[PDB]
Amino acid sequence: TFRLRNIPLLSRVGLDRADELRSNPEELAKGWAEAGLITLDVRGRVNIVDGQVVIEDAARIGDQPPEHAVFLGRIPGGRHVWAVRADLDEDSAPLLDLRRSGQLFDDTSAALLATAMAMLAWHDNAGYSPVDGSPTIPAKGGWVRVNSATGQEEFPRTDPAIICLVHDGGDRAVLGRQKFWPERMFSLLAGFVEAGESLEACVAREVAEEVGLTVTDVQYLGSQPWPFPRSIMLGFHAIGDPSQPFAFNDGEIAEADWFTRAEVRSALEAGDWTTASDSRLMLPGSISIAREIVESWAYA
Amino acid sequence: TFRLRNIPLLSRVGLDRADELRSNPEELAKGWAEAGLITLDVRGRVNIVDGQVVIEDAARIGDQPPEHAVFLGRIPGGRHVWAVRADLDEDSAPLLDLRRSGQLFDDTSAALLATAMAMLAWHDNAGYSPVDGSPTIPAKGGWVRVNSATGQEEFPRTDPAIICLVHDGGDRAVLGRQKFWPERMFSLLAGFVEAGESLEACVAREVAEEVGLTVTDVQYLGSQPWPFPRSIMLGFHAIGDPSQPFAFNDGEIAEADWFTRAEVRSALEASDSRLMLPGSISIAREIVESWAYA
Ligand SMILES: NC(=O)c1ccc[n+]([C@@H]2O[C@H](COP(=O)([O-])OP(=O)(O)OC[C@H]3O[C@@H](n4cnc5c(N)ncnc54)[C@H](O)[C@@H]3O)[C@@H](O)[C@H]2O)c1
Ligand SMILES: NC(=O)c1ccc[n+]([C@@H]2O[C@H](COP(=O)([O-])OP(=O)(O)OC[C@H]3O[C@@H](n4cnc5c(N)ncnc54)[C@H](O)[C@@H]3O)[C@@H](O)[C@H]2O)c1
Numbered sequence: 114t115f116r117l118r119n120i121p122l123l124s125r126v127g128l129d130r131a132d133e134l135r136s137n138p139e140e141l142a143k144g145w146a147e148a149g150l151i152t153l154d155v156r157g158r159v160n161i162v163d164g165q166v167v168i169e170d171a172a173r174i175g176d177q178p179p180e181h182a183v184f185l186g187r188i189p190g191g192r193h194v195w196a197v198r199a200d201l202d203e204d205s206a207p208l209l210d211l212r213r214s215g216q217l218f219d220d221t222s223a224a225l226l227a228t229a230m231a232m233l234a235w236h237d238n239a240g241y242s243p244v245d246g247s248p249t250i251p252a253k254g255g256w257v258r259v260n261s262a263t264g265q266e267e268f269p270r271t272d273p274a275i276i277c278l279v280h281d282g283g284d285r286a287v288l289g290r291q292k293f294w295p296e297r298m299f300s301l302l303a304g305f306v307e308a309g310e311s312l313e314a315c316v317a318r319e320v321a322e323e324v325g326l327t328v329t330d331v332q333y334l335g336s337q338p339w340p341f342p343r344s345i346m347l348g349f350h351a352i353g354d355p356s357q358p359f360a361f362n363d364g365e366i367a368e369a370d371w372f373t374r375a376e377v378r379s380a381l382e383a384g385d386w387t388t389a390s391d392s393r394l395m396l397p398g399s400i401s402i403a404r405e406i407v408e409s410w411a412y413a
Numbered sequence: 414t415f416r417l418r419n420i421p422l423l424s425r426v427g428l429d430r431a432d433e434l435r436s437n438p439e440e441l442a443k444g445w446a447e448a449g450l451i452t453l454d455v456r457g458r459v460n461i462v463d464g465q466v467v468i469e470d471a472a473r474i475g476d477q478p479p480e481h482a483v484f485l486g487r488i489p490g491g492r493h494v495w496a497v498r499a500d501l502d503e504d505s506a507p508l509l510d511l512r513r514s515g516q517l518f519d520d521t522s523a524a525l526l527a528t529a530m531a532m533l534a535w536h537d538n539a540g541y542s543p544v545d546g547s548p549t550i551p552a553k554g555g556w557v558r559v560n561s562a563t564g565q566e567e568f569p570r571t572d573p574a575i576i577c578l579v580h581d582g583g584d585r586a587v588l589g590r591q592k593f594w595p596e597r598m599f600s601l602l603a604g605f606v607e608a609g610e611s612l613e614a615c616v617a618r619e620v621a622e623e624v625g626l627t628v629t630d631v632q633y634l635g636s637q638p639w640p641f642p643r644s645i646m647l648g649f650h651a652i653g654d655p656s657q658p659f660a661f662n663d664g665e666i667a668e669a670d671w672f673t674r675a676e677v678r679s680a681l682e683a684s685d686s687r688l689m690l691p692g693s694i695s696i697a698r699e700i701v702e703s704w705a706y707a
């Protein structure tokens with residue numbers, strides 16, 4: 114019935130990733146002369162100025178691009194841009210992380226940071242082949258790691274996960290509370306995609322596990338990179354029957370109920386998960402595609 | 414604007430995977446008594462009988478379930494089913510691909526096989542932590558491997574990939590040929606999802622890399638598990654402009670062109686023509702077909 118009103122945060126622009134150059138050490142070296150550089154702490158946090166990620170003049174850590182660096186592409190202009198991990202002084206400047214402060218960034222800076230954050234985290238967890246055990250080595254602007262023994266390439270890992278709004282086909286929708294959340298704190302149902310299933314099967318499965326409903330007419334709404342540490346979230350809605358009672362089998366879910374559009378609007382207008390307020394239902398931070406899905410349904 | 418006519422092979426709501434039991438060694442052991450067993454060789458091949466997967470009596474390889482096995486869940490009527498990697502004797506009829514022959518199987522058997530095939534392939538490539546390098550060990554019905562040093566869990570890896578039909582908004586569609594394919598053999602454009610991008614951005618990016626078009630109105634069609642060895646394919650269509658010339662930049666693409674509705678229908682039935690299509694259980698075929706018959 115409905116569509117997303119807004120493009121989810123972190124999806125708003127695609128970089129010029131400049132795929133061409135990744136395997137061209139020389140053109141990388143030529144453009145490093147006056148390239149840009151972005152720097153992340155071990156927490157993914159970064160420095161922000163005027164809503165933009167801080168881009169340092171690049172040739173101040175090297176004459177040539179280092180091995181631990183990751184090529185992110187070209188900004189509007191033509192200038193190469195890279196990311197490194199480095200320790201950052203916590204006390205000399207505010208360090209912003211994407212999950213709690215992504216909305217303060219411009220769209221480009223958010224893309225850069227999301228990419229950089231997921232890649233650097235990947236390298237930190239891919240220094241060895243899972244196949245045999247050999248050490249691995251960065252190559253091609255940091256987009257592969259090559260095995261030392263065999264020469265086999267290993268590639269960045271993004272794990273797909275669904276998030277779903279179950280509704281009755283009209284004016285009512287399922288929201289649920291996980292046991293490990295504060296009270297009065299609800300959202301959509303989510304799950305990782307297992308091997309050997311479609312997204313549509315994954316939605317029906319996870320819904321059935323978590324709240325015990327049978328759902329149909331499973332439909333994609335959109336997608337959002339989610340580097341915490343390495344997910345991509347895929348948004349869906351589906352139709353359930355309110356007359357079928359709930360059942361918490363995969364007991365991740367403490368409680369759940371059907372809510373009206375009215376109820377949800379009221380909850381949205383009182384804030385998100387991070388607001389202190391009176392309300393007996395509070396919903397997720399606008400960072401999440403979950404909030405965009407709920408909002409898109411509740412206002413029509 | 415248009416939809417898939419059929420649910421892709423392998424994509425029908427599948428199995429009672431019985432997630433509950435995976436971390437309950439004892440209930441697994443109780444049900445092994447007269448469980449079922451499915452067996453896959455190193456090439457992913459399997460045996461068929463009467464349109465169904467071969468399910469052997471399970472207890473004939475041990476008293477208890479082995480560690481290299483993988484629990485697949487319960488068939489209709491509480492009965493556990495497991496998968497193991499083993500050699501096959503080949504005095505039965507063994508399907509070299511499920512990829513080329515999965516159409517012979519009932520939906521359930523195809524789900525079982527798809528799950529089994531992706532899991533077993535995963536174990537074979539996940540015997541070590543990528544973090545530190547330690548050995549890893551099966552656990553929980555084969556659904557995790559635990560690190561030997563640190564105790565940290567590693568989980569099955571399914572890599573998401575897009576596959577896209579670019580069309581002009583009317584009667585013409587892009588198909589492309591990879592280098593070292595037979596001539597006159599074209600298909601959809603595909604690419605892996607990189608870190609930090611949406612599916613919609615991934616489609617536009619991969620299309621631009623491979624054939625040099627700028628595309629808009631990117632729309633999801635459906636999805637299909639693709640254990641060859643470890644993908645999930647996400648089907649899309651998008652609008653491009655035929656007046657913009659092609660360009661093979663990253664160009665694993667040898668050649669490409671726009672084809673008419675008519676040309677595609679003819680190719681689907683198909684030698685003779687300038688365009689033939691590969692014969693697969695792939696969602697690619699279902700996408701092309703669904704566009705061509707409006
Ligand atoms: N409202 C929400 O619930 C909400 C909001 C924003 C983001 N998310 C995201 O939903 C995603 C999916 O996770 P979830 O919260 O539904 O499940 P979960 O994290 O609550 O628990 C599922 C568990 O399955 C295991 N697992 C299974 N397969 C895995 C895999 N392939 N890769 C990594 N771990 C795997 C992990 O231990 C995981 O914790 C998470 O990344 C979460 O950040 C959810
Ligand atoms: N029409 C088709 O070509 C068609 C049809 C059905 C299925 N598929 C499947 O789509 C998937 C990806 O397609 P592609 O190979 O054209 O994508 P692509 O354009 O990203 O090619 C990248 C190449 O580099 C490697 N690579 C890059 N990222 C990888 C990753 N994240 N995981 C594993 N390898 C990676 C692979 O070896 C691949 O051959 C594959 O499973 C492929 O078999 C394609």
Ligand SMILES: [Ca+2]
Binds near residue numbers: 131132133621622662
């Ligand atoms: Ca390019």
Ligand SMILES: [Ca+2]
Binds near residue numbers: 203204
């Ligand atoms: Ca401090």
Ligand SMILES: [Ca+2]
Binds near residue numbers: 365
């Ligand atoms: Ca879950």
Ligand SMILES: [Ca+2]
Binds near residue numbers: 304305
């Ligand atoms: Ca799950």
Ligand SMILES: [Ca+2]
Binds near residue numbers: 304322363432
């Ligand atoms: Ca679950």
Ligand SMILES: [Ca+2]
Binds near residue numbers: 371
């Ligand atoms: Ca009620």
Ligand SMILES: [Ca+2]
Binds near residue numbers: 322362431432433
């Ligand atoms: Ca269950």
Ligand SMILES: [Ca+2]
Binds near residue numbers: 500501502503
């Ligand atoms: Ca044999």
Ligand SMILES: [Ca+2]
Binds near residue numbers: 500501502
């Ligand atoms: Ca034999």
Ligand SMILES: [Ca+2]
Binds near residue numbers: 602603604623665
């Ligand atoms: Ca490709």
Ligand SMILES: [Ca+2]
Binds near residue numbers: 605
């Ligand atoms: Ca690519």
Ligand SMILES: [Ca+2]
Binds near residue numbers: 619623663
């Ligand atoms: Ca490519």
Ligand SMILES: [Ca+2]
Binds near residue numbers: 670671
């Ligand atoms: Ca032509």
